[PDB]
């Protein structure tokens, strides 16, 4: 088969989709002729590629699911790899997300005690959000419970990263709602140590 | 529409006491320290036209010395006092 098809799982090599094929060629082309990615890509492959429209905006989001065992590999070169993939795919935002299993919360206390804590929905959803914003880290988290009974989560980021993530925040919130079916709102703190929220 | 109402829809309350505009506390008939303050509205010119805004402050707040702070908060809320000076 095509040499660039080993950047996908062997399941999808037979009949790759258009987006999976395009990502595979870009990863294979980046496997060479790139200093930082040549050291890590050869051991790396992706699971699937999914497109999200992100309404009230242009520049749809390409979500690239990869196996969780490559988390450290992706983390080391996430910034460079995201930029190169976005360069190869104009009019798109690239989101590298690790495929994670979720263990349904048992109704039995003895089964609850044996649940792996990284398989819980809360841990998985936080890690998915951390994947989404990776260069920036969560500096604070709050839940506003309105008088109507709704509870909305606000995630604060460091204001020093505003020029690198503010444009993508709307895309991040929608794709997070797609993957996790939970809502997240974003804010910026110029002094996270003192809980100082940036006004503008 | 305020107060105790009958099954026949008749208000059975003797009267409806005032509520403090700072703490939403009922002002009792024996307070004698609760005050009512009227602030005149001002038109485009510096002249009061015909109208006032009324504030009710419970007597306990005045005894604690927090009536001035409460009146500051209420007037800022109602748009009477400016919370800060303008930009230079």
């Amino acid at each position: 088969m095509q040499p660039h098809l080993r950047k996908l799982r062997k399941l999808k090599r037979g009949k790759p989709s258009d987006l999976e094929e395009s990502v595979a060629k870009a990863l294979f082309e980046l496997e060479a002729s790139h200093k930082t990615l040549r050291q890590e890509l050869p051991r790396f492959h992706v699971n699937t590629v999914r497109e999200v429209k992100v309404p009230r905006s242009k520049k749809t989001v390409l979500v690239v699911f990869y196996p969780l065992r490559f988390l450290m590999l992706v983390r080391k070169v996430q910034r460079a790899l995201t930029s190169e993939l976005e360069k190869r795919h104009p009019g798109c935002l690239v989101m590298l997300v690790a495929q994670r299993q979720i263990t349904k919360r048992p109704t039995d206390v003895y089964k609850l005690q044996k649940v792996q804590r990284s398989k819980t929905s809360t841990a998985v959803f936080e890690n998915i959000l951390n994947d989404m914003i990776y260069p920036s880290d969560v500096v604070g988290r709050r839940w506003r419970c309105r008088t109507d009974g709704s509870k909305l989560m606000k995630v604060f980021l460091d204001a020093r990263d505003r020029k690198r993530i503010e444009s993508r925040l709307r895309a991040v919130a929608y794709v997070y709602k797609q993957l996790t079916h939970r809502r997240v709102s974003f804010g910026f703190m110029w002094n996270p140590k003192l809980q100082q929220v940036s006004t503008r | 529409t305020i107060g105790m109402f009958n099954e026949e829809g008749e208000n059975v309350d003797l009267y409806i006491p005032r509520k403090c505009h700072a703490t939403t506390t009922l002002i009792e008939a024996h307070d004698h320290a609760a005050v009512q303050i009227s602030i005149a509205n001002v038109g485009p010119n510096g002249v009061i036209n015909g109208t006032t805004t009324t504030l009710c402050i419970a007597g306990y707040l005045r005894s604690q010395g927090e009536s001035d702070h409460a009146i500051n908060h209420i007037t800022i809320d109602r748009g009477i006092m400016r919370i800060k000076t303008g930009k230079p």
Partner: protein
């Protein structure tokens, strides 16, 4: 007697894990060689074109 039973189970476990590690190393090398064949045939196509 409990000591021999416990030791035997531990020995079986170490043998099982060692066998699995060898098998995974075998599949890794076979796939790596196959990847070499794919790249070599890619070079052959480049020579044609």
């Amino acid at each position: 007697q409990l000591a021999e039973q416990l030791a035997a189970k531990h020995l079986r476990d170490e043998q099982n894990r060692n066998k699995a590690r060898k098998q995974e190393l075998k599949k890794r090398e076979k796939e790596r060689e196959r990847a070499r064949r794919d790249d070599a045939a890619a070079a052959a196509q480049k020579k044609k074109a």
